[PDB]
């Protein structure tokens, strides 16, 4: 039971860590989007970064 309790606590800490992985309101890892697109050139063509949900 002590091992199970520790396991459940570490599991909840994973949720906290993933939800806090934001830089000024945007995240590539919290699961809230499928991708972020950054500018690649002056015409506005995108540099895609696929989201990796943690």
């Amino acid at each position: 039971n002590a091992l199970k309790s520790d396991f459940d606590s570490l599991r909840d800490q994973i949720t906290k860590a993933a939800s806090n992985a934001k830089f000024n309101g945007v995240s590539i890892a919290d699961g809230t989007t499928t991708k972020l697109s950054f500018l690649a050139n002056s015409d506005g063509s995108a540099f895609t970064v696929t989201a990796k949900t943690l």
């Binding site: 000024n24 309101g25 945007v26 500018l39």
Partner: protein, 55 residues
């Protein structure tokens, strides 16, 4: 002689036209600088990593 003397009015008019175009070119300097800054704003706002306040 009267024809040669009336060329002074022609020269005054052509100089007036050069002055009018000069003022337009000064305003055009302003406007092309503004358009370059505006393109910089639109280019930055098309990035989707911006939060709402930056947009």
């Amino acid at each position: 002689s009267a024809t040669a003397g009336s060329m002074n009015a022609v020269k005054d008019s052509l100089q007036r036209g050069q002055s009018t175009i000069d003022v337009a070119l000064a305003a055009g300097d302003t406007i092309t600088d503004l358009l370059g800054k505006m393109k910089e704003k639109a280019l930055a706002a098309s990035d989707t990593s911006l939060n709402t306040a930056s947009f």
